[PDB]
Design a protein around this ligand. Structure first.
Ligand SMILES: Nc1ncnc2c1ncn2[C@@H]1O[C@H](COP(=O)(O)OP(=O)(O)OP(=O)(O)O)[C@@H](O)[C@H]1O
Ligand SMILES: [Mg+2]
Lengths: 469, 517, 47, 122, 50
């Protein structure tokens, strides 16, 4: 009666014809059926264009192998809807809201449309604010923004998943919040790895996983970020809870948008990305913000094509990023966890008008000392240590102490060591590093600075290692 | 003698039982044909990716479906397609035969033997586009897949269920790396243990025919054709064959993986499959993107490479290891298809021509090569003796600018320089000579324990060679308990050190000097 | 004098590396864009 | 045409054919000159979408079978001294020995201007 | 082509001619203009296939 029928199938792009008064909205989710029993499934098409003559062009979110022309297409009357609520915590979903570990779970929850508008202009927060995580290096040298965006440049084997678990723990305990992990273009191996790791660390009960995997057509790899964002938006707006959203490889969201644009026959822009690259990145990142006292903070892994920071995809992504955390392997080999590169990280609110004058002074002094040590490190490594001066040695010893004190007993290490993690207030961090640069701890042995919290933990370690003052 | 009336009565068997009643079929008609694509009017019920039968046994695949025609890719013998011919419907999407009779054969990207040794007895059929294992159907990659190559097996280990890209310019030794990885499973096949046997599938896409013949000859001279299938889409085959070849090779070896077996699959030059699919999609007039690629080419490769998995225990525990090969141009890993496959896979092995000319063979750039699985894909002995190796080579590479001024360097700096030269000479390896993991453990023990500081750098290889020879003849117990216990306990290390010292006092350098500390 | 000269020389070489990398990435993007323009121009000419 | 004459000499007469081909690249270039006139969308560098497959249909006939020999030798033009051009990059995969001449060696007066670091043999 | 015809008429009578094509690039540009105005599909740099 009021249902359509397939007309053209060319790859993931399906054209559907509807009766005259039954043309679906843009972004509506239609349901076609593949009945060939080898590939029997239910295709979820997403209306993308109105072609005239009652034809609509849709992008299929499943592979269209086995689809026949003329099969009935049912209109759902709404866009892709994901299940929302607290019951989505501890489970894994895909871009469509289907539970992957327990199929059929969430069919009875409230459902929210993944296409929403950002907060109204009168509802935005005009004053930026720092998100006190409790980590010394992050709170001091790279202060995160509450409701802002953080790039994460951690490679492989530098403890990036451990830092993810750490931020999960901190937002769930220091802020009474929650976490949503968007795997955009997520490898199924690493998806299962992350699932079992979060289940073992017992931080799955605090996280909602949404995986748009790599073996899927570009539609779901494009919409999975919005699915996870809608879950986080429910947690912030309706539950009244600070959220932390992990978008791993936002670049794959950009790339899926580019692929969908090429499939739809649109003319490519500069370099090759879609003509609406900035608008897509904007409609995504504008929803991650602070609203009415609650917040959604995002940690996003970014890929830089050909290491070109002028490439349109990272040049567009970085217009929305507020901080940067680079996980170094050199710092990881030193046993310093989290392996945050202090000179190579950065933050936009390390400014006296936000953090204060003393915080800025201490951070700049620490960065100066670490950079001078980085200058001296090669002459040390080739010629030897006391080829240097004694001023140079004073600086090198102070810098080793400072570089080792930036490590921490993270909440993610409690499962392996039993001892609870630390949460150092920013004032105590400023005091500690001020005293470290002044030289008040140049005699305490270096090992006394590895993986400790505030100043009292440093003192206790020094006492159990036979030194003080 | 030959089974004569066996022949004639076999065919009388075939005909007497010839029954093909008059079924009702749904036909169409070719309206145009060119460059390997045929448009077919009619066929209202044909589905996407369905096999179509043209006159003369020609096969096509229904790719484009619209209100006028069906654009189909002719799968060979395209020059026999005419406007006005009748196209019959099959009702089946692309599938291939699968079974154990495929071991030792060379087949089409359709399951048809092209080596001429008769037909292949098939267990079952399997569709080409069956979905990959679910995110919950998997298991952490934990067992090692030994390539027999010291550089790979020590620096960028490969697990069972992992996707390791082999990427290089050309004539850098990628096919050699994969052929040696195949040959190294000979001893695991001889063991008769189904939990240690690795079946191999070698997909050859767009290669010269004599090149595939040479690869098969190398795999035969190594006795590796008892557990290896070759899915060959030669350069003379159609674009549809080159596009389908890795899906045929992956449909085979998924039967095995789901039967609780462990498989390795080598997609030789996925770049040629990408170019065949680009040809197909441009002839079907699909929108081109960057480098004229259709826009679903990333999907083309990721759908293929996500079927390489490590299944859970309730699915049998089988695994499929992938070794996709990518050929770059002028070391441009920032190209389109290189970027896609680097994004997809779990680790990369970058082979370079500059390293290949300097004598570093296999020419694996250990500075940029990576394995995201890592130490989980190693045995204890190799994880111990080769955890020292990465930053040794880092220090050596950042010190080799001072090679002409070792007099001006610190003690530790000159030590690192000499150790790095020795270790670089250690990872060199001949072609088609893979080593078991115990011999690799012993060689890297030579390297990192310091037992090479007395040997000239131009004598390391031979030294190591001879030592292993000695150990294979005299002290086989060390290698045996390394193989059996997967760990080099301290007593085995003591006996190994003493063996090394004795061999040293027996060994003669090429300059005539000594190698004794 | 040689130590200072070689310090300044390595700094100049670093800045030259940076500038050449910037120009090379600029060209790389330009070549991709021009190739796409040619491909799409032909594809539109045929339609 | 010339390949058909050589194939006759190889299959029917059967004696030690030599087959020289001056600029097999002109085959691909002529294929690309008519491609759009035939109504085909162009591929990357303006070549026909069927570059590799036409080249493989031609090159796989230039071969020696078991017992029948054809020593083939082809000159291959490299457009604008760019060895990454799709035509030579596709011709590379069809050969047992490639002698690669260079203009950097030509400019030095060294003849034959063979690039020893790029030339190869199986 | 006009100059080449004028020269070939002499060449075929046993005479020796020298013809100088000043900026064949301008001819290629003119041919590209013609082919793009006749809406023939372009190649590289919008040049015709021939
Ligand atoms: N470990 C090695 N030691 C010495 N020579 C090697 C080694 N590996 C490869 N070679 C030589 O390098 C040449 C090229 O090797 P191979 O064919 O494996 O490279 P390729 O990546 O397949 O190049 P292409 O695919 O372009 O032919 C071969 O002739 C082989 O003899
Ligand atoms: Mg090869």
């Amino acid at each position: 009666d009021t249902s359509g029928r397939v007309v053209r199938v060319t790859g993931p792009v399906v054209d559907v014809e509807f009766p005259r008064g039954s043309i679906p909205e843009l972004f509506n989710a239609l349901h076609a059926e593949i009945t060939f029993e080898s590939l029997a499934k239910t295709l979820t098409l997403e209306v993308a264009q109105h072609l005239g003559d009652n034809l609509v062009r849709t992008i299929s979110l499943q592979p269209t192998d086995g689809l026949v022309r003329g099969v009935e297409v049912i209109d759902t009357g709404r866009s892709i809807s994901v299940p929302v609520g607290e019951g989505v915590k501890g489970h894994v979903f895909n871009a469509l809201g289907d539970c992957l570990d327990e199929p059929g779970y969430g069919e009875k929850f409230e459902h929210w449309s993944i296409h929403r508008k950002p907060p109204a202009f009168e509802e935005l927060e005009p004053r930026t604010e720092m998100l006190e995580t409790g980590l010394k290096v992050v709170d001091l040298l790279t202060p995160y923004v509450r409701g802002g965006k953080i790039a994460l440049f951690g490679g492989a084997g530098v403890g990036k998943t451990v830092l993810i678990q750490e931020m999960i723990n901190r937002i769930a305990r220091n802020f009474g919040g929650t976490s949503v992990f968007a795997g955009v273009g997520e490898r199924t191996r690493e998806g299962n790895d992350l699932w079992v790791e979060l289940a073992e660390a017992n931080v799955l009960k605090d996280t909602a996983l949404v995986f748009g995997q790599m073996d899927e057509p570009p539609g779901t790899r494009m919409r999975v970020a919005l699915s996870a964002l809608t879950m986080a938006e429910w947690f912030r707006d309706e539950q009244g809870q600070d959220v932390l959203l992990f978008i791993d490889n936002i670049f794959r969201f950009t790339q899926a948008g580019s692929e969908v644009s090429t499939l739809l026959g649109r003319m490519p822009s500069a370099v090759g990305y879609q003509p609406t690259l900035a608008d897509e990145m904007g409609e995504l990142q504008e929803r991650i913000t602070s609203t009415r006292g609650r917040s959604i903070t995002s940690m996003q892994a970014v890929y830089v094509p050909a290491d070109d920071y002028t490439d349109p995809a990272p040049a567009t992504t970085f217009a929305h990023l507020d901080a940067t955390t680079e996980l170094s392997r050199a710092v990881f080999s030193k046993g310093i966890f989290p392996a945050v590169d202090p000179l190579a990280s950065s933050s936009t609110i390390l400014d006296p008008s936000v953090v204060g004058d003393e915080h800025y002074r201490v951070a700049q002094e620490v960065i100066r000392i670490l950079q001078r040590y980085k200058d001296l490190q090669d002459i040390i490594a080739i010629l030897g240590i006391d080829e240097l001066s004694e001023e140079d040695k004073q600086l090198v010893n102070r810098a080793r102490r400072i570089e080792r004190f930036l490590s921490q007993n993270m909440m993610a290490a409690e499962q392996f060591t039993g001892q609870p993690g630390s949460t150092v207030p920013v004032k105590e961090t400023i005091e500690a590093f001020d005293r470290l640069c002044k030289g008040d701890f140049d005699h305490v042995p270096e090992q006394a600075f590895f993986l400790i919290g505030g100043l009292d933990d440093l003192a206790k370690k020094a006492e159990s290692l036979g030194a003080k003052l | 003698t030959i089974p004569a009336d066996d022949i004639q009565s076999a065919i009388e068997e075939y005909v007497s039982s010839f029954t093909a009643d008059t079924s009702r079929e749904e036909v169409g008609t070719v309206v145009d044909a060119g460059d390997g694509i045929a448009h077919v009017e009619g066929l209202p019920s044909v589905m996407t990716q369905e096999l179509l039968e043209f006159p003369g046994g020609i096969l096509g695949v229904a790719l484009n479906l619209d209100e006028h025609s069906v654009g189909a890719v002719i799968l060979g013998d395209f020059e026999n397609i005419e406007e006005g011919q009748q196209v019959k419907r099959t009702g089946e999407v692309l599938s291939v035969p699968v079974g154990d009779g495929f071991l030792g054969r060379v087949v089409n990207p359709l399951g048809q033997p092209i080596d001429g040794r008769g037909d292949v007895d098939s267990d079952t059929r399997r569709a080409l586009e069956l979905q990959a294992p679910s995110v919950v159907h998997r298991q952490g990659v934990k067992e090692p897949l030994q390539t027999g190559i010291k550089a790979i097996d020590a620096m960028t280990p490969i697990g069972r269920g992992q996707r390791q890209l082999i990427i290089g310019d050309r004539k850098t030794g990628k096919t050699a790396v994969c052929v040696d990885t195949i040959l190294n499973q000979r001893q695991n096949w001889e063991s008769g243990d189904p939990k240690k046997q690795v079946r191999c599938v070698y997909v050859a896409i767009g290669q010269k025919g004599t090149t595939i013949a040479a690869v098969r000859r190398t795999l035969e001279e190594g006795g590796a054709m008892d557990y290896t299938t070759i899915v060959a889409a030669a350069a003379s085959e159609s674009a549809g064959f080159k596009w389908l070849a890795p899906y045929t090779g992956s449909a085979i070896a998924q039967h095995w993986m789901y039967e609780g077996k462990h498989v390795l699959i080598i997609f030789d030059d996925l770049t040629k499959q990408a170019e065949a699919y680009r040809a197909i999609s441009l002839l079907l007039r699909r929108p081109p993107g960057r480098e004229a690629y259709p826009g679903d080419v990333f999907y083309l490769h990721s759908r293929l490479l996500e079927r390489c998995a490590k299944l859970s225990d309730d699915l049998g525990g089988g695994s499929l290891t992938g070794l996709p090969i990518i050929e770059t141009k002028a070391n441009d890993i920032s190209a389109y298809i290189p970027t896609n496959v680097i994004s997809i896979t779990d680790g990369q092995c970058f082979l370079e021509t500059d390293l290949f000319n300097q004598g570093v063979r296999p020419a694996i750039n250990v500075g940029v090569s990576v394995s995201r699985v890592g130490g989980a894909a190693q045995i204890k002995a190799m994880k111990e003796v080769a955890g020292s190796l990465r930053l040794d080579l880092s220090q050596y590479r950042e010190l080799e600018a001072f090679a002409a001024f070792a007099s001006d360097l610190d003690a530790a700096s000159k030590a690192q320089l000499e150790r790095g030269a020795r270790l670089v000479e250690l990872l060199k390896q001949p072609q088609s000579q893979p080593m078991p993991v115990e011999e690799q453990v012993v060689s890297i023990f030579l390297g990192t324990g310091g037992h090479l500081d007395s040997v000239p750098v131009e004598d390391v290889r031979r030294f190591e060679t001879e030592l292993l020879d000695h150990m294979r003849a005299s002290e086989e117990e060390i290698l045996t308990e390394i193989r059996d216990s997967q760990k080099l306990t301290e007593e085995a290390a003591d006996k190994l050190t003493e063996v090394i010292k004795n061999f040293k006092k027996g060994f003669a350098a090429t300059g005539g000097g000594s190698v004794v500390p | 004098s040689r130590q200072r000269a070689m310090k300044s020389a390595t700094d100049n070489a670093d800045d030259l590396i940076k500038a050449l990398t910037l120009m090379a990435n600029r060209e790389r993007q330009a070549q991709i864009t021009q190739e796409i323009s040619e491909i799409v121009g032909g594809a539109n000419a045929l339609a």
